[PDB]
Write an enzyme that holds these catalytic residues in place. Structure first.
Site: not given
Ligand SMILES: CCCCCCCCCCCCCCCCCC(=O)OC[C@H](COP(=O)([O-])OCC(O)COP(=O)([O-])OC[C@@H](COC(=O)CCCCCCCCCCCCCCCCC)OC(=O)CCCCCCCCCCCCCCCCC)OC(=O)CCCCCCCCCCCCCCCCC
Ligand SMILES: CCCCCCCCCCCCCCCCCC(=O)OC[C@H](COP(=O)([O-])OCC[N+](C)(C)C)OC(=O)CCCCCCCCCCCCCCCCC
Ligand SMILES: CCCCCCCCCCCCCCCCCC(=O)OC[C@H](COP(=O)(O)OCCN)OC(=O)CCCCCCCCCCCCCCCCC
Ligand SMILES: CCCCCCCCCCCCCCCCCC(=O)OC[C@H](COP(=O)(O)OCCN)OC(=O)CCCCCCCCCCCCCCCCC
Ligand SMILES: CCCCCCCCCCCCCCCCCC(=O)OC[C@H](COP(=O)(O)OCCN)OC(=O)CCCCCCCCCCCCCCCCC
Ligand SMILES: CCCCCCCCCCCCCCCCCC(=O)OC[C@H](COP(=O)(O)OCCN)OC(=O)CCCCCCCCCCCCCCCCC
Ligand SMILES: C[C@H](CCC(=O)O)[C@H]1CC[C@H]2[C@@H]3[C@H](O)C[C@@H]4C[C@H](O)CC[C@]4(C)[C@H]3C[C@H](O)[C@]12C
Ligand SMILES: *C(=O)CCCCCCCCCCCCC
Lengths: 12, 124, 128, 165, 171, 127, 221, 122, 71, 88, 81
Positions: E37, J42-44, J46
């Site tokens: 990540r 939240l971002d994509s 996540d």
């Protein structure tokens, strides 16, 4: 819980 | 794009990508889920050979060229080593096992009328 | 630095590794638009008949008819005897028959010669 | 047959060292075992080969049933990478799966010992191809490696199956 | 067609699955789950369409070099050892209309309630045809998405087979 | 990126219909409407004799069911098989061939009473 | 003999009764799987009696009860070879199959065609016993191919799964290649020895037996 | 084994050939040599119906053992006394074979020294 | 599947066991270990060695009948 | 097949239970219809991590095309419930 | 039959191997937002599972106990005859 079961005709 | 006009008998039938039906997207709502086909779509000339129960042309984790080398290399090496070991048998330091009555002449269906060449085994 | 993927006729190029999927211009983005336009028109035609409640029978797909027709009926009228076909026909049509004839012909002649000379074992052979 | 059998046991046993699917692993175990039977025939010990057949069915059949028990409990999961911690969760399947592995590996005086261990002795003390003899001995080592593979990735460690099972 | 963002999102999902297969253990997988990540997070801000895409191609090409040869597949997913397992027990609904009259008599309620849907289907069919042929451009549809019902008492066009599909465990 | 306004509606409408169709699939308490069928007296015998637990008299059913099976599946076939072999197969030449029993030194023959001589004196040694 | 021979055949016949009874004689759809499991249990017990007879005294015999066909000097008979191998193996096969069928009653408990499933499992055991007790090559071939097809009918049990069909037809493909050697062995014995009974094959004991043995090795592969 | 290396990674003429042994007359090196006797006649082995591979000098212990099992049925644990007697009898016979193999090795090695001694002076 | 003593599934928790289930599992494992030990005591040679293996390098030339190098 | 069925109440309970274990989402701000983007921020990426946790919870894959359109727990419960013929 | 879900607040990554990941991810400034989700696999009946060698030794305590007594009985019984 009893659910109907679809089947092809069995009589013939 | 039609097939080449080489006279083999293809006519003007489309030439589709030589991709197996196994590669097509499985999640799309195909009209024919088993064939992964769509109603009205032009069918590959060799569609019957590319059904999911036959030739599969999906990408492989190992390159095709390398896979042949590894498979060919392993089998050939195994064959040679078996040939090597055939000439160099393994065994134990034991003499021929001895049997009585002329090496079991009459037990193996030997002819009684022709008396066998005497065979005698000595103590040791 | 990774080993560039090698593709054969039995191993396609992964769509992820295809450069054609990144050089996306308006034309390439437009071409896929046309595809989904034709693919959409056919889908509507199939769904209208498929969901019809007054319809009973088989939906005759014209594509299926064309595929079979090309495989059986349309082959010969589009056949021209030329170098490629003439040698392929002789190679595959006639090559196997001549090869097997001499394989079997030699085998039976050799066996017959032994039998006439008494050199072949037929001690218990009484079933032929 | 001696050469044909030896390559079968070496190749298929080598293939079982890396398979994830529980059923696939036992499938290659059978092929590895069958090659052992073929080699037994090649060294001219047909009765030892037959003896291994009778004894093999017992512990081999049990393993598949024990694997079926695990597969059913986890809602039709076959990859060993989604198991673990079953030593105390399935005590009876845990016990049988251990017995099957020990018998398969040829633990002294279990069912496997009276056939498998009696063969390798015959293989070593017979006029036989040297390379064929080696492959069988190497294969027997692999029998232990992938036999452990099942227990380690299914009965030990922390559970890797979904939350509700 | 897929957007550039979607392809990166797809690659993010695929890599974790293959990474999970190698790692097996949760804690070991969890540790590297954040490390991957991190590699994705840092290049979020890259706003150059050429440079950003070039990063993706290497990302795809590194994954193909490091993919698991035997990735874990969920049992029912395409390739898993349950895919299409129960397709042999899925019988289409219309097979009931061929049942013998004495065979239907064993389920009087089910077939009585069946006629409501069949009656409902016939009644709603013609309306579903009219709804689609007015929202359809001159050259026909350009996409496969369909509109919903836009009145009271109307049902979405082409709904029968979506509604009446066989269950996932029909037997 | 998510659903468009209409998509959340068509799924909601279809999902609302889909659940309604799935509800209808359930059966009534009476269904299936089994047609009348005549049952043999023995079925009524065992149904009522077995209402209680009574371990002692339940094992009789185990014995009975095994007793019935052991007769119509084991005893009768061997009567037919043995009858078939004794008077039809054994009456023809070489249909059944036995490997003659092994005769060891120091044994008496039932047919004749002959005594086979024992082997010679071994140089016995307990090792 | 009268007991050794009778109890040997009753074991084989006991297995065919559940198959024969499937033709609507006694209708017990729910407990038919238990009927098949119980049949094995008694079948195993009977097979134990001949095994004890062999163990005690090494008794063996052939049973050529039926005369099926006669091709000139070749006489094909339905023959069962009760010997060391078959006598020792039948108890083991039945004992294992007894556990599997009891296991199957649970594993396949929710399968709509469990009654059909337990019939195929029973057909395979019948054909396997034909192979094991075969006394002549042709009878061995019947069970040799019989077990092969029952494998195909069970591998592709979930006929909707495209991969099940692919694997089921794949077992037939490889097994068929092996059978090429089996036909080769049958032909060589018939041409050179004029027999298919294992008895006459051994008594003549052919010297140059590379071809028949190579064919058998191909079949076993 | 270990003597295999001496033959493959070493001279072979000074190593026995199992497919050609023995290579010297039995009388050589054993004046007034004795012979092994069969304690079980052929008719006894024939009646006992022993496998041809078991018709060795160690027979007449196998025959006694087979008799014990037939009589001692169903007690299969018993008769362990006869098994060891037949096993040891087999072991002694096996060793006597090893003596022939090692006798062959020494005699051939002796022929190696003899050839050098006789040929060098020539 | 159906039948047998029923146990309620648990969410994110170790499953319930039974006295009969756990007891039976232990007994067989103990029965396995007794069998190995008892067999090992009575049949040690079956895994260690039946009879001592002779050493060729200790036999004499007169029992092997090797004439002296002189003649 | 010995696996108890899934009810609407149970599915929604499991969906929220999974998210409540997420460190980047505050339980108080987490509701049945709390949009992952417009409410929980939240971002994509996540968003994808949520689905992966969801799939392992129910043990069945969701296609990328249909997973990217799920932005709130209520929608996810609808997708899972419909995918398994869950009605009551 | 409503299932009473365990209270989720008890799921913590303290004292377990998940902490080791947390410590190491801190050395690079990173944090693991799923640790508590996978915490149940390490606490409860799933905690402190046996080692592989321990598994092979199951029942050895009882097995040996039944063995030592048994040999004694055989030791004395065969002494008489
Ligand atoms: C043993 C072989 C038995 C095979 C069998 O019966 O399974 C049928 C079975 C039927 O399939 P199914 O899926 O169960 O049927 C389901 C139906 O949908 C529904 O089936 P159903 O459950 O509702 O009812 C059962 C049956 C109902 O059948 C009936 O009600 C009547 C059947 C009568 C047949 C005999 C009538 C002919 C006799 C007239 C002469 C009488 C003279 C009197 C004087 O219906 C059928 O199975 C179809 C009829 C098949 C008839 C052909 C077979 C008999 C030919 C003889 O066949 C298979 O599944 C595939 C074949 C399996 C065997 C393959 C391997 C064969 C290996 C060789 C066998 C051994 C050869 C001999 C050995 C020699 C050494 C000892
Ligand atoms: C003289 C010997 C006999 C010669 C004839 C036999 C030689 C082989 C020629 C026939 C092979 C092709 C059979 C016709 C096509 C049917 C099978 C098929 O289409 O392939 C699908 C299947 C593919 O099955 P699969 O298991 O490999 O993969 C299926 C695809 N997935 C996994 C993605 C779902 O092929 C086969 O099963 C058979 C191929 C092997 C047979 C050829 C090798 C023979 C042994 C070599 C040593
Ligand atoms: C007891 C021991 C038993 C052992 C049994 C097992 C033996 C195994 C022996 C090792 C086998 C190794 C395989 C070697 C054959 C490899 C053939 C090959 O790789 O070529 C196939 C060819 C691929 O190349 P291609 O796609 O045509 O090139 C790109 C064009 N677009 O594509 C083609 O098909 C072109 C036609 C050529 C086909 C190959 C020749 C046949
Ligand atoms: C004997 C084999 C002869 C093969 C060599 C002859 C073929 C050849 O060389 O081609 C010559 C000619 C093609 O010339 P081309 O100019 O390209 O075509 C005409 C354009 N106006 O060819 C032609 O134009 C006409 C084709 C003449 C040859 C046709 C007959 C050859 C045999 C065909 C295969 C027969 C298969 C029989 C099957 C047996 C049973 C299975
Ligand atoms: C061209 C067809 C005629 C032909 O060529 O057959 C001739 C051939 C005999 O002639 P030849 O082989 O030259 O003399 C020695 C024979 N021992 O005939 C023979 O007897 C040998 C077999 C002939 C093999 C070649 C046949 C050609 C393919 C079939 C004809 C296709 C048209
Ligand atoms: C090549 C080997 C493989 C070949 C297999 C081919 C597939 C065949 C399928 C299996 C067929 C089953 C075979 C066993 C049944 C035999 C049928 C039979 O009994 O035939 C009558 C038989 C007398 O026949 P036989 O004198 O030996 O010569 C026959 C030449 N056609 O016996 C009799 O005389 C009849 C005596 C009957 C006495 C008992 C009757 C009471 C029981 C009736 C109810 C059961
Ligand atoms: C004996 C066996 C189980 C007995 C037990 O409870 O242990 C029972 C279970 C189902 C029974 C069978 C089925 O009921 C079908 C048949 C019914 C008729 O009574 C004839 C015998 C028949 C073939 C039965 C024989 C036997 O009694 C069976 C096989
Ligand atoms: C010889 O007769 C058989 C071939 C030898 C096989 C065993 C190989 C292992 C022996 C070498 C290691 C010895 C030292 C422990």
């Amino acid at each position: 819980k009893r659910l109907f079961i679809i089947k092809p005709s069995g009589f013939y | 794009e039609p097939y080449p006009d080489d006279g083999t008998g293809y006519g003007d039938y489309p030439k589709l990508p030589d991709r197996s039906q196994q590669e097509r997207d499985p999640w799309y709502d195909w009209d024919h889920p088993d064939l992964r086909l769509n109603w009205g779509e032009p069918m590959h000339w060799d569609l019957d050979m590319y059904i999911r129960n036959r030739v599969d042309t999906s990408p492989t984790p190992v390159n095709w060229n390398l896979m042949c080398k590894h498979l060919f290399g392993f089998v050939a090496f195994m064959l040679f080593m078996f040939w090597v070991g055939e000439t160099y048998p393994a065994y134990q330091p034991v003499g021929p096992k001895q049997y009585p009555y002329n090496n079991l002449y009459l037990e193996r269906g030997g002819d009684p009328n022709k008396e066998p060449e005497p065979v005698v085994h000595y103590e040791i | 630095s990774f080993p560039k993927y090698e593709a054969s006729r039995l191993s396609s190029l992964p769509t992820t590794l295809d450069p054609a999927e990144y050089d996306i211009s308006s034309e390439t983005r437009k071409a896929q638009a046309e595809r989904l336009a034709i693919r959409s028109r056919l889908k509507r035609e199939y769904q209208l008949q498929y969901y019809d409640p007054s319809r009973r029978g088989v939906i005759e797909d014209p594509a299926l008819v064309r595929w079979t027709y090309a495989r059986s009926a349309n082959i010969y009228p589009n056949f021209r005897p030329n170098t490629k076909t003439s040698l392929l026909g002789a190679l595959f049509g006639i090559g196997p028959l001549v090869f097997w004839y001499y394989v079997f012909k030699t085998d039976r002649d050799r066996k017959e010669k032994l039998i006439q000379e008494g050199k072949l074992d037929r001690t218990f052979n009484i079933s032929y | 047959t001696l050469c044909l059998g030896a390559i079968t046991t070496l190749f298929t046993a080598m293939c079982a060292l890396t398979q994830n699917d529980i059923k696939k692993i036992i499938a290659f175990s059978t092929s590895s075992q069958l090659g052992l039977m073929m080699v037994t025939i090649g060294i001219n010990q047909p009765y030892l080969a037959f003896l291994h057949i009778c004894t093999h069915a017992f512990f081999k059949a049990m393993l598949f049933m024990c694997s079926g028990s695990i597969i059913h409990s986890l809602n039709d999961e076959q990859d060993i990478r989604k198991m673990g911690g079953l030593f105390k969760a399935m005590p009876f399947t845990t016990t049988a799966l251990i017995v099957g592995s020990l018998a398969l590996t040829g633990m002294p005086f279990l069912t496997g010992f009276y056939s498998k261990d009696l063969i390798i002795e015959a293989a070593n003390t017979s006029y036989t191809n040297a390379w064929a003899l080696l492959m069988t001995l190497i294969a027997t080592s692999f029998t232990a490696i992938y036999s452990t593979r099942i227990i380690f990735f299914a009965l030990l460690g922390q559970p890797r199956f979904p939350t509700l099972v | 067609y897929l957007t550039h963002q979607q392809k990166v999102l797809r690659l993010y999902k695929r890599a974790l699955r293959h990474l999970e297969s190698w790692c097996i253990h949760r804690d070991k997988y969890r540790y590297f789950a954040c490390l991957l990540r991190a590699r994705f997070d840092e290049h979020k801000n890259e706003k150059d369409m050429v440079k950003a895409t070039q990063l993706l191609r290497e990302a795809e090409e590194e994954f193909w070099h490091g993919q698991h040869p035997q990735p874990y597949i969920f049992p029912e997913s395409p390739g898993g050892t349950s895919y299409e397992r129960y397709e042999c027990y899925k019988v289409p609904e219309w097979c009931l209309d061929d049942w013998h009259p004495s065979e239907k008599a064993m389920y009087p309620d089910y077939f009585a309630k069946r006629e409501q849907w069949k009656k409902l289907r016939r009644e709603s069919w013609e309306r579903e045809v009219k709804q689609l042929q007015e929202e359809t451009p001159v050259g026909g549809p350009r996409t496969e998405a369909l509109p919903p019902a836009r009145k009271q008492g109307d049902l979405p066009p082409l709904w029968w087979h979506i509604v009446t599909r066989p269950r996932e465990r029909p037997m | 990126s998510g659903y468009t306004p209409e998509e959340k509606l068509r799924l909601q409408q279809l999902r609302e219909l889909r659940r309604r169709w799935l509800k209808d699939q359930e059966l009534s308490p009476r269904e299936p409407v089994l047609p009348p069928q005549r049952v043999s007296p023995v079925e009524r015998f065992w149904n009522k004799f077995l209402q209680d637990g009574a371990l002692w008299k339940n094992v009789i059913y185990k014995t009975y069911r095994h007793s019935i099976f052991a007769f119509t599946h084991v005893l009768i076939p061997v009567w037919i098989i043995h009858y078939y072999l004794k008077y039809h197969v054994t009456t023809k030449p070489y249909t059944i061939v036995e490997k003659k029993p092994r005769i060891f030194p120091g044994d008496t023959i039932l047919e004749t009473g002959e005594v086979i001589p024992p082997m010679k004196e071994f140089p016995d040694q307990h090792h | 003999m009268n007991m050794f021979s009778s109890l040997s055949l009753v074991t084989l016949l006991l297995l065919t009764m559940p198959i024969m009874m499937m033709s609507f004689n006694t209708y017990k759809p729910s407990n038919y799987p238990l009927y098949v499991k119980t049949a094995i249990s008694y079948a195993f017990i009977t097979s134990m009696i001949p095994t004890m007879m062999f163990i005690h005294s090494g008794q063996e015999l052939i049973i050529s009860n039926w005369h099926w066909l006669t091709i000139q000097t070749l006489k094909l008979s339905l023959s069962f070879k009760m010997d060391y191998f078959s006598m020792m193996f039948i108890p083991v096969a039945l004992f294992v199959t007894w556990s599997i069928m009891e296991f199957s009653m649970w594993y396949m408990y929710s399968d709509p065609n469990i009654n059909k499933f337990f019939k195929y499992l029973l057909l395979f055991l019948i054909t396997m016993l034909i192979l094991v007790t075969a006394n002549n090559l042709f009878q061995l071939f019947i069970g040799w191919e019989g077990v092969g097809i029952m494998s195909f009918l069970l591998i592709g049990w979930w006929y909707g799964r495209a991969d099940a069909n692919t694997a089921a037809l794949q077992a037939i493909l490889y097994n068929r290649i092996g059978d090429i050697g089996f036909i080769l062995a049958m032909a060589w014995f018939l041409t050179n020895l004029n027999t298919w009974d294992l008895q006459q094959i051994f008594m003549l004991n052919p010297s140059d037996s590379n071809m028949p043995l190579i064919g058998l090795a191909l079949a076993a592969t | 084994g270990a003597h295999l290396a001496r033959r493959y990674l070493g001279d072979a003429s000074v190593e026995p050939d199992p497919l050609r042994m023995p290579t010297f007359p039995p009388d050589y090196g054993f004046p007034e040599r004795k012979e092994r006797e069969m304690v079980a006649t052929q008719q006894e082995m024939n009646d006992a119906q022993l496998v041809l591979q078991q018709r060795d000098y160690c027979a007449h212990y196998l025959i006694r053992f087979l008799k014990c099992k037939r009589d001692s049925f169903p007690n299969f644990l018993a008769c362990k006394h006869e098994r060891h007697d037949w096993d040891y009898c087999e072991h002694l016979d096996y060793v006597k074979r090893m003596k022939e193999f090692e006798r062959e090795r020494r005699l051939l090695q002796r022929k190696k020294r003899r050839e050098q001694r006789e040929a060098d002076m020539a | 599947a159906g039948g047998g003593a029923h146990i309620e599934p648990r969410y994110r928790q170790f499953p319930q066991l039974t006295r009969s289930q756990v007891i039976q599992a232990e007994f067989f494992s103990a029965t396995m270990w007794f069998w190995i030990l008892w067999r090992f005591w009575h049949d040690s040679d079956a895994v260690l060695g039946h009879f001592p293996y002779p050493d060729p390098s200790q036999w004499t030339d007169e029992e092997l009948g090797i004439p002296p190098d002189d003649e | 097949s010995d696996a108890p069925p899934l009810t609407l109440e149970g599915i929604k309970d499991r969906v929220l239970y999974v998210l409540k274990l997420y460190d980047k989402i505050d339980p108080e701000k987490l509701s049945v219809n709390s949009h992952f983007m417009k409410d929980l921020g939240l971002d994509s990426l996540d968003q994808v991590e949520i689905i992966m946790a969801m799939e392992d919870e129910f043990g069945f894959e969701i296609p990328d095309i249909d997973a990217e359109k799920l932005m709130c727990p209520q929608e996810i419960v609808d997708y899972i419930a419909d995918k398994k013929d869950v009605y009551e | 039959s409503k299932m009473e879900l365990p209270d989720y607040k008890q799921w913590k990554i303290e004292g377990t191997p998940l902490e080791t990941v947390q410590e190491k991810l801190a050395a690079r400034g990173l944090r693991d937002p799923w640790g508590r989700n996978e915490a149940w696999r390490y606490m409860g009946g799933f905690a402190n599972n046996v080692s592989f060698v321990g598994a092979l030794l199951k029942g050895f305590k009882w097995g040996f106990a039944a063995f030592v007594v048994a040999i004694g009985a055989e030791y004395y019984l065969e002494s008489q005859k």
